[PDB]
Amino acid sequence: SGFRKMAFPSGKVEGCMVQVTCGTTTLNGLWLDDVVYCPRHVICTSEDMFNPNYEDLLIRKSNHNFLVQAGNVQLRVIGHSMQNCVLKLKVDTANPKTPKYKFVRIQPGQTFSVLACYNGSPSGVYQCAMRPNFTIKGSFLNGSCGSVGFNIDYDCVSFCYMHHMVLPTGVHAGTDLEGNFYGPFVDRQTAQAAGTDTTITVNVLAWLYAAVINGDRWFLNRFTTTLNDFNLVAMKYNYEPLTQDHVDILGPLSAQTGIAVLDMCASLKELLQNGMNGRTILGSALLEDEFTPFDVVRQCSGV
Amino acid sequence: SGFRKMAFPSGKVEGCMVQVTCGTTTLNGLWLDDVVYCPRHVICTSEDMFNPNYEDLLIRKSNHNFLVQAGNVQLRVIGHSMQNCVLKLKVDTANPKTPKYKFVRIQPGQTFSVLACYNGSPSGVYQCAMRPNFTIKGSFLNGSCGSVGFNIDYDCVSFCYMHHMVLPTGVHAGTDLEGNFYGPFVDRQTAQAAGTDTTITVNVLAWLYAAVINGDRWFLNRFTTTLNDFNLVAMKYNYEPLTQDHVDILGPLSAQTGIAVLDMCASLKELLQNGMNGRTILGSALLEDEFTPFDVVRQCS
Ligand SMILES: *[C@@](O)(CO)[C@H](C[C@@H]1CCNC1=O)NC(=O)[C@H](CC(C)C)NC(=O)c1cc2c(OC)cccc2[nH]1
Ligand SMILES: *[C@@](O)(CO)[C@H](C[C@@H]1CCNC1=O)NC(=O)[C@H](CC(C)C)NC(=O)c1cc2c(OC)cccc2[nH]1
Ligand SMILES: [Cl-]
């Protein structure tokens, strides 16, 4: 009963967050086994940040140049390497609270939980989606760098995002835990624009099924559409094309509600062409696209 | 800003969640020091649930009828009592993960994080607002009662909600950690209707202050009002009347922007009587009422 933007419980990640300081720069790090992972621009200065030759700046640093603090305990750095935009600080102590984990690179349209952290301390947790243009619409303030995004499957934490940047438009950019940015961004102190964003169509459809499962059907109609005719209209409105894989992934929700996927597409088509007028869906005046089919299934199955 | 619903990190509460079973009835409990708190209806059999006599059901129970488990590890129950709609089970082990905590009863409009749990295992965390009609718009499946709502201040967890009921309309109802329901509801297997809901005025005002902090201030007018005058008008638009506490918790935002609370109230009054006239505030044509003055500062600071 009910439907809400839900994040995974953050405890397993809270126990990995530490504070990393180099010179006058302080941000968050992720302590897994005997390594602390953080954004490499912590080794920058105020001047370096506009065009940093990271390899050149890193060689000039010593292990003792890195102050790592887990609570009221200082961790001794005994090694340091760089993997793309991620600094890897070897410490003399394995984190005793390390969970079962892996590093994964998430795909656009997929969701993850963000643990926002400042000075190594967790501050809040919320759910985000990888936008088609590889930005995320996060909530990050000064000092949030090194905050991580993750999913949980059973006891396994899959880390997928580390936070680096805010764009002039207010959306955010970061890397996976191998230090590769999502999108065309670069960890230099410059104003960067993203590619034109699109709406995550399969997620909007999942969310419409959620609204039906929660007893709201005002947007349904008797009509049906072909996949291609739907995609022509969606593309006109800057919606991502719906693939057959997307159609299949929506199977369960379609079965649960007995509304054919292409039947829901006809409803979305009508919503795009006419608008919602004054009405709302699941409390929103806008078409929500940051719930995946799985998000909806986990909250609405058997409901 | 980028105003999202943001929950508190849930780890301190995860370490307190257990499952409690009586017969085949299982739900969640909260293990703090050597006490486990849980909804008293765990002692009901499927059939008792329509109009239980809890005092009578409970006199027929002994400590050894209660199965409390942290994961798969049983915690022996050595004492039991009922306090309103909550059962308190004394166990022989003090929870080593017990945080600093208090039990607080919140006012309508206040927000809190809900850690949804099933069979003692946390599954998700999200932010809720206590509606003026004492419901919350949660996301709760079978097996969710005993899940708790909380705030975190410094290192201290303030527990404010324990889940008990879903209403016919799909909203949710529950108690504080002393077992006292929010609103007129009771822990019975019966359809219970919530009063008509109203908009949380104090939070709308917080949201307007947030808009002003962000340079979005077209709606400010050069008027002020009395609190009485505003309340009388607000009620005609199904808005909650403001209290002195509401005026007080808006103080920091009023000082930050230099706009007196009653001046902001006159601006809201004009929006109510005239509408948005096809404009948006913070990007939305809807006025948001689920961010408290604290949430605003917190997300902006
Ligand atoms: C990290 O905390 C830095 O350690 C920080 C996160 C942002 C601060 C405000 N909100 C955030 O998400 N990241 C930065 O400050 C990065 C640092 C780079 C990678 C060296 N830079 C930016 O986010 C950045 C720079 C510029 C800019 O130039 C100058 C112009 C416009 C936007 C912009 N963002
Ligand atoms: C707890 O998990 C029970 O342990 C459960 C929470 C709901 C399950 C689905 N979503 C929830 O939020 N609570 C209940 O089942 C309670 C049990 C009472 C306290 C004995 N009852 C209800 O939620 C309930 C019963 C009825 C009803 O009857 C008749 C008619 C309409 C609504 C309704 N809700
Ligand atoms: Cl039910």
Residue numbers in the entry:
A (entry chain A): 1 to 303
B (entry chain B): 1 to 301
Show passages lifted from the paper.
The SARS-CoV-2 main protease (Mpro) is essential for viral replication and is a primary target for COVID-19 antivirals. Direct-acting antivirals such as nirmatrelvir, the active component of Paxlovid, target the Mpro active site to block viral polyprotein cleavage and thus replication. Residue 166 of Mpro, although highly evolutionarily conserved in coronaviruses, is proposed to be one of the critical sites for drug resistance in SARS-CoV-2 Mpro, with E166 variants showing the largest decreases in potency against nirmatrelvir. We determined the cocrystal structures of SARS-CoV-2 Mpro E166A, E166V, and E166V/L50F variants in complex with PF-00835231 to sub-1.9 Å resolution.
E166A/L50F and E166V/L50F variants demonstrated 10- and 950-fold potency loss, respectively. When L50F was added to E166V, the double-mutant variant E166V/L50F had increased catalytic activity which was boosted by 185% relative to its single-mutant variant and from just 6% to 11% of WT. L50F has been reported to co-occur with E166 mutations to possibly compensate for the loss in enzymatic activity and therefore has been suggested as a background mutation that can accelerate resistance selection. In each of our determined structures, PF-00835231 was bound in the expected conformation with strong electron density observed for the covalent bond between Cys145 and the carbonyl of the hydroxymethyl ketone warhead of the inhibitor. In complex with PF-00835231 or nirmatrelvir, Glu166 makes three key hydrogen bonds to form the S1 subsite: between Glu166:OE2 and Ser1:OG, between Glu166:OE1 and Ser1:N, and between Glu166:OE1 and the nitrogen of the γ-lactam ring. However, in each of the inhibitor-bound Glu166 variant structures presented here, all three of these hydrogen bond interactions that define the S1 pocket are absent. Our structures of E166A, E166V, and E166V/L50F Mpro variants demonstrate two N-terminus hydrogen bonds absent in the WT complex: between Ser1:OG hydrogen and Phe140:O and between Ser1:OG hydrogen and the nitrogen atom of the γ-lactam ring. The N-terminus of E166V/L50F was well-resolved in an atypical position, folded away from the active site. In the E166V and E166V/L50F variant structures, water molecules are positioned to substitute for the OE1 atom of Glu166, facilitating interactions with Phe140 and the inhibitor. The most resistant E166V and E166V/L50F had a Tm increase of a modest 3°C–4°C when nirmatrelvir-bound.
